[PDB]
Write an enzyme that holds these catalytic residues in place. Structure first.
Site, PDB file in Angstrom:
ATOM      1  CB  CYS A   1       2.301   0.949   7.488  1.00 47.39           C
ATOM      2  SG  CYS A   1       0.629   1.459   7.953  1.00 47.39           S
TER       3      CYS A   1
ATOM      4  N   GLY B   1       2.158   6.156  10.128  1.00 46.69           N
ATOM      5  CA  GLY B   1       3.566   6.024   9.763  1.00 46.69           C
ATOM      6  C   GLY B   1       4.230   4.772  10.318  1.00 46.69           C
TER       7      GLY B   1
ATOM      8  CG  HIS C   1      -0.609   0.175   2.492  1.00 46.59           C
ATOM      9  ND1 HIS C   1      -0.701  -0.911   3.357  1.00 46.59           N
ATOM     10  CD2 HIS C   1      -0.207   1.252   3.201  1.00 46.59           C
ATOM     11  CE1 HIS C   1      -0.287  -0.481   4.540  1.00 46.59           C
ATOM     12  NE2 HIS C   1      -0.001   0.810   4.513  1.00 46.59           N
TER      13      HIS C   1
HETATM   14  O1  LIG Z   1      -4.510   1.773   8.704  1.00 43.40           O
HETATM   15  C1  LIG Z   1      -3.753   2.611   8.217  1.00 43.40           C
HETATM   16  N1  LIG Z   1      -2.761   3.213   8.926  1.00 43.40           N
HETATM   17  C2  LIG Z   1      -2.457   3.035  10.300  1.00 43.40           C
HETATM   18  C3  LIG Z   1      -1.880   1.875  10.826  1.00 43.40           C
HETATM   19  N2  LIG Z   1      -1.661   1.640  12.129  1.00 43.40           N
HETATM   20  C4  LIG Z   1      -2.028   2.578  12.991  1.00 43.40           C
HETATM   21  C5  LIG Z   1      -2.628   3.807  12.622  1.00 43.40           C
HETATM   22  C6  LIG Z   1      -3.020   4.790  13.565  1.00 43.40           C
HETATM   23  C7  LIG Z   1      -3.580   5.966  13.152  1.00 43.40           C
HETATM   24  C8  LIG Z   1      -3.774   6.219  11.800  1.00 43.40           C
HETATM   25  C9  LIG Z   1      -3.421   5.292  10.858  1.00 43.40           C
HETATM   26  C10 LIG Z   1      -2.841   4.051  11.234  1.00 43.40           C
HETATM   27  C11 LIG Z   1      -3.919   3.117   6.780  1.00 43.40           C
HETATM   28  C12 LIG Z   1      -4.704   4.431   6.796  1.00 43.40           C
HETATM   29  N3  LIG Z   1      -6.125   4.152   7.074  1.00 43.40           N
HETATM   30  S1  LIG Z   1      -7.003   5.268   7.816  1.00 43.40           S
HETATM   31  O2  LIG Z   1      -8.362   5.075   7.438  1.00 43.40           O
HETATM   32  O3  LIG Z   1      -6.358   6.520   7.619  1.00 43.40           O
HETATM   33  N4  LIG Z   1      -6.944   4.911   9.377  1.00 43.40           N
HETATM   34  C13 LIG Z   1      -7.098   5.636  10.668  1.00 43.40           C
HETATM   35  C14 LIG Z   1      -7.277   4.277  11.355  1.00 43.40           C
HETATM   36  C15 LIG Z   1      -6.771   3.606  10.072  1.00 43.40           C
HETATM   37  C16 LIG Z   1      -6.794   3.412   5.997  1.00 43.40           C
HETATM   38  C17 LIG Z   1      -5.989   2.195   5.616  1.00 43.40           C
HETATM   39  C18 LIG Z   1      -6.631   1.168   4.925  1.00 43.40           C
HETATM   40  C19 LIG Z   1      -5.951   0.029   4.544  1.00 43.40           C
HETATM   41  C20 LIG Z   1      -4.609  -0.074   4.829  1.00 43.40           C
HETATM   42 CL1  LIG Z   1      -3.755  -1.520   4.364  1.00 43.40          CL
HETATM   43  C21 LIG Z   1      -3.932   0.927   5.508  1.00 43.40           C
HETATM   44  C22 LIG Z   1      -4.624   2.066   5.932  1.00 43.40           C
END
Ligand SMILES: O=C(Nc1cncc2ccccc12)[C@@H]1CN(S(=O)(=O)N2CCC2)Cc2ccc(Cl)cc21
Ligand SMILES: O=C(Nc1cncc2ccccc12)[C@@H]1CN(S(=O)(=O)N2CCC2)Cc2ccc(Cl)cc21
Ligand SMILES: [Cl-]
Ligand SMILES: [Cl-]
EC number: 3.4.19.12
Lengths: 302, 298
Positions: free
Chosen positions: A145, A143, A41
């Site tokens: 990931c 960040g 991603h």
């Molecule tokens: O989850 C993801 N990142 C994170 C990962 N870990 C801890 C986080 C804490 C805080 C913000 C991000 C975080 C990303 C971004 N998000 S997001 O909708 O922005 N989101 C807030 C909760 C998750 C969608 C998304 C969808 C699919 C995939 Cl593979 C990655 C991701």
């Protein structure tokens, strides 16, 4: 004496953490030999996440679209390929700090250490378990990931997890190092949710044996149980079923303490019924399920 | 999201761990530049008299599969300093710092000069640590990291009868009223680190746990009368100032959170948990909460 949630020393993994940038997205990568492993991603924008076609997004990229930074040194990408949900970036320099390693896929209930990273820089280390619903209860911010989970039994680092996303309940989902997700999760911003979670029964039993080894027996009783009667009661408290494999795995701890597994099961049934009545077990007022039988043997005295 | 008991990455300390053997005793040493630091009890008490009988070659120092040669030895308080012929090429930027009760640090538990695990703990108000150590763990060290500098604050020396641990700073001064010898010693009555529980309640609010909040506030004096009754350390104006940033982020004044803590002490949790715990957690400082909820790297 004592019993702590103990992580493996992280040095061998710290020397593998790098920063990966593609366009506006920056996350962590794992540099082993001449390959950098990271979540696929990293090639997506926020809009792409609803229904990304990774094969279509990847074909539009060249090697020089990926910026890999190891400390204050830029590594040059000379190849790229996708394997399931991970991107493998071939670089021109082999990591001189590459430890002895393996990629292992773990089962729910297994524990591991997580080296949480931001911008290719390690910030902290903690202990985790793969929950029965295939999520992990981590501590991750945006960040994080690409941060990895591992075990280091006998100089060899066994990489078992790479972080990809946070679910709506605040729990985390990711893959093994071959890019296969744990659970039914997808690297897509779809309405996804963790399934109902359960307690890891074999781990609670292991931790009760750790408490006996450390000198506490207040929770023991004169009763025993059949395995089937124990499972009928335990499932009423959202505890995972205990299998004959789990009973065999607890054999060594049973032999060391002189307490039969089914006798420890009767103690657990009574703890579930009564609570702790103002008491603690190894400094905890809740029944702990993130220590495996192997972790207890590793940390506790013989 | 999430909140875990998090330790600092241990790599900079792993590259300093060595094994020290004197006679039949084997323990851990910390190799920084050309000196190996270890508990003086490795010699086996009149330590000046025991030490004068030893020569440099009586100390066997092993760094991985390499034997280091001892070319000098001296004692500083309860720490033995073994001058070696090789400077540690892995020596990080470091300082020796003495911490106060309530401060937290990471412990790299070692056996035979080999690191086995890392965990986070706090210096209790009774000057002991609730560590996890077996025989052979002596010489294992506690530390914090500030950017790139390792601040060594603890060296393990012994286990007390209640299973808790006692040690020194890296200058060999004990934390607590302990001595390095086999004699009747006991941990004093411990108290709860109030400023740390408040910090953990702010971490719970940041993570979306607010059930314990109330409309009430209190004075520092009234709160301190409650803290004394429940074996909690007194809260000072310095603690209130230190909690300022967390108070500003959540919109909950420190005395407002003190009123929440008072109600938790007087009434319990009533079947509820906070950050997955049924007990009030006191081993996270205000800085630990800010660091974990902001992602500071090293
Ligand atoms: O989850 C993801 N990142 C994170 C990962 N870990 C801890 C986080 C804490 C805080 C913000 C991000 C975080 C990303 C971004 N998000 S997001 O909708 O922005 N989101 C807030 C909760 C998750 C969608 C998304 C969808 C699919 C995939 Cl593979 C990655 C991701
Ligand atoms: O405490 C010490 N070592 C340890 C340290 N940590 C964790 C241990 C776990 C298990 C066994 C030893 C452990 C040593 C040895 N003990 S001992 O009486 O053998 N003892 C059993 C509980 C402590 C006396 C002693 C006296 C003074 C000094 Cl400075 C060191 C020491
Ligand atoms: Cl497994
Ligand atoms: Cl003396």
């Amino acid at each position: 004496s004592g019993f702590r949630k103990m992580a493996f020393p992280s040095g061998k993994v710290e020397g593998c953490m790098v920063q990966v940038t593609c366009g506006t997205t920056t996350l962590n990568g794992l540099w082993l030999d001449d390959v950098v492993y990271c979540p696929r991603h990293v090639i997506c924008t926020s809009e792409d996440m609803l229904n990304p076609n990774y094969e279509d997004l990847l074909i539009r990229k060249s090697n020089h679209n990926f910026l890999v930074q190891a400390g204050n040194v830029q590594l040059r990408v000379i190849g790229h390929s996708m394997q399931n949900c991970v991107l493998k970036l071939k670089v021109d320099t082999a990591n001189p700090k590459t430890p002895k390693y393996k990629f292992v896929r773990i089962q729910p209930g297994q524990t591991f250490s997580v080296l949480a990273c931001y911008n290719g820089s390690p910030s902290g280390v903690y202990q985790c378990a793969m929950r029965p619903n295939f999520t992990i209860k981590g501590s991750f911010l945006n960040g994080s990931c690409g941060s990895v989970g591992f075990n280091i039994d006998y100089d060899c680092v066994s990489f078992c997890y790479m972080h990809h996303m946070e679910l709506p309940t605040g729990v985390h989902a990711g893959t093994d190092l071959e890019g296969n997700f744990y659970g039914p999760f997808v690297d897509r911003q779809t309405a996804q949710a963790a399934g109902t979670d359960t307690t890891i029964t074999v781990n609670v039993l292991a931790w009760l044996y750790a408490a006996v080894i450390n000198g506490d027996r207040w929770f023991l009783n004169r009763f025993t149980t059949t395995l089937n009667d124990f499972n009928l009661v335990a499932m009423k408290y959202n505890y995972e079923p205990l299998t004959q494999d789990h009973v065999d795995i607890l054999g060594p701890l049973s032999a060391q303490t002189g307490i039969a597994v089914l006798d420890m099961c009767a103690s657990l049934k009574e703890l579930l019924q009564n609570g702790m009545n103002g008491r603690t077990i190894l400094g905890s007022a809740l029944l702990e399920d993130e220590f495996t039988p192997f972790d207890v043997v590793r940390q506790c005295s013989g």
